[PDB]
């Protein structure tokens with residue numbers, strides 16, 4: 001006795017940052033081979049209401065000498081979903097609901113270098129933010145100490161700001177004071193410090209990934225699935241998708 005709400009999360013980042021590991025971690029909260037192709041993974045989860053969660057795994061980039069050929073297949077997948085949705089909106093014969101395969105949210109994995117963002121990730125996120133909602137994440141946050149994590153977060157924040165990378169929740173979309181407070185609590189977490197679960201409590205040789213004090217994956221999951229879910233979709237539709245509609 002519930003209804004199905006669709007939600008699409010895409011993981012993006014360099015090779016071996018724990019993208020696939022986080023996906024199975026995220027689904028198992030309700031050797032992984034090398035990701036060579038873009039794969040969508042869908043499972044129905046009942047958080048009172050049923051949600052049709054789809055997670056899109058992507059092959060890592062930054063591994064070659066030229067990475068423009070790596071930033072292209074992901075941009076095509078995003079726009080193709082924007083294309084598949086638009087071909088059904090113009091479809092005047094269609095009596096049925098449109099299935100939403102559009103990427104609503106996109107996690108971006110940042111390597112724990114402990115320094116400023118590299119030109120690659122900067123240019124990549126600037127492209128992605130222009131066509132989709134990005135949520136930057138500190139890949140393998142267990143790599144860093146407590147002190148280093150604080151310093152790294154402070155630095156990543158400065159880059160997004162200095163490079164004009166608008167991440168969710170974009171400040172230009174805050175309605176009132178109550179909307180801003182909840183959004184501030186989200187932005188203060190960016191970049192989210194996540195940890196993939198090695199075997200099984202979902203732990204990491206030990207580090208409980210579902211613990212809010214050990215890492216921030218528990219917060220990120222609930223915020224994206226429960227708290228910020230509908231707001232992301234609304235911005236994906238009214239802002240990002242309309243930007244695509246006008247271009248074509």
Ligand SMILES: Nc1nc2c(ncn2[C@@H]2O[C@H](COP(=O)(O)OP(=O)(O)OP(O)(O)=S)[C@@H](O)[C@H]2O)c(=O)[nH]1
Pocket residue numbers: 013014015016017018019020021022032033034035058059060139140141142143194195196197198204
């Ligand atoms: N220390 C640590 N290691 C992790 C974490 N998450 C994943 N790993 C390790 O990283 C390695 C790669 O995990 P993986 O899922 O392959 O990243 P990946 O991006 O899929 O590799 P690729 O798909 O981009 S080519 C695995 O050996 C996994 O155990 C994490 O949070 N902390």
Ligand SMILES: [Mg+2]
Pocket residue numbers: 019020021034035057058059060
């Ligand atoms: Mg992978």
